[PDB]
């Protein structure tokens, strides 16, 4: 994927305490760049490159359509509860849509909704129809399939969203093209007959990374447990991989970090 634009939204009956019931977030190439919630009632910048390249009219405009959507989701919770015979209790409406520009120039457009975790409805852009995942989505399918909504959504995903993505990506040219070298630490812990070696990578960008444990040079892809890639507050990422070994084979083991910032994979020992 060359570039991606994605907007997500969540409508909740149970946020809960002191929390906004409606939250809406936007992403350019994975990076969080904008959000809106029901408490603040304003669509705001969440990065410097978006704020520097958008005026006041842009945000007023984004705020309006986020407030309009909020009301839709407010009534939407009531509508779906009546269709399911609820309350019920606590319920959630989720939506994600956007653009994927692929490395071959292919444009991918998606828009799909979910109720209470499970798939509700999705837009088939090629047939210009909405696919109902559940029986309760059928009335919604009928409403959307009547007007010009299909064409409007088709145009947005194929043109509008694509054209704005092309713009956002040039605004964040420098911040998105960043290379951040991970800070790596190796720690070892002796416990009741087993030695657990830990390998932590701190503050790398971009997100994709390969961290694995080697024994004498050969990768131990079986015994090793990974924590996956998790985000830091500043926009960088974090990961950890641990390995169980017989003590003391610490001299035999090596952590191999493979990342875009490194001209060759980093090797680390204990």
């Amino acid at each position: 994927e060359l570039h991606t634009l994605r907007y997500i939204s969540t409508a909740m009956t149970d946020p809960g305490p002191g929390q906004p019931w409606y939250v809406d977030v936007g992403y350019v190439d994975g990076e969080l760049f904008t959000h809106y919630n029901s408490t603040a009632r304003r669509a705001v910048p969440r990065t410097e490159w978006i704020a520097a390249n958008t005026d006041q009219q842009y945000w007023d405009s984004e705020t309006q359509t986020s407030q309009r959507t909020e009301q839709i989701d407010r009534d939407g919770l009531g509508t779906l509860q009546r269709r399911y015979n609820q309350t019920g209790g606590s319920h959630t409406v989720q939506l994600m849509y956007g653009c994927d520009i692929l490395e071959d120039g292919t444009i991918r457009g998606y828009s799909q909704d979910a109720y209470d975790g499970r798939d509700f409805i999705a837009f088939d852009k090629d047939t210009m129809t909405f696919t109902a995942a559940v029986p309760e989505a059928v009335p919604t399918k009928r409403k959307w399939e009547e007007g010009d909504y299909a064409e409007g959504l088709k145009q947005y995903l194929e043109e509008t969203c694509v054209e704005w993505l092309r713009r956002y990506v040039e605004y964040g040219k420098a911040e998105l093209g960043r290379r951040e070298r991970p800070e790596v630490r190796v720690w070892g812990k002796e416990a009741d007959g087993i030695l657990t070696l830990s390998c932590r990578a701190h503050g790398f960008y971009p997100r994709p990374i390969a961290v694995s444990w080697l024994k004498d040079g050969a990768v131990q892809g079986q015994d090793a447990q990974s924590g996956g890639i998790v985000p830091n507050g500043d926009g960088t990422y974090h990961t950890w991989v641990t390995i169980d070994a017989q003590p003391g084979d610490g001299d035999k083991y090596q952590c191999r970090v493979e990342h875009a910032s490194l001209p060759q994979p980093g090797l680390y020992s204990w």
């Binding site: 669509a43 939407g76 409403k143 509008t160």
Partner: peptide, 8 residues
């Protein structure tokens, strides 16, 4: 930019 939506 965020798109416009319609009632469920």
């Amino acid at each position: 930019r965020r798109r416009e939506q319609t009632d469920y």
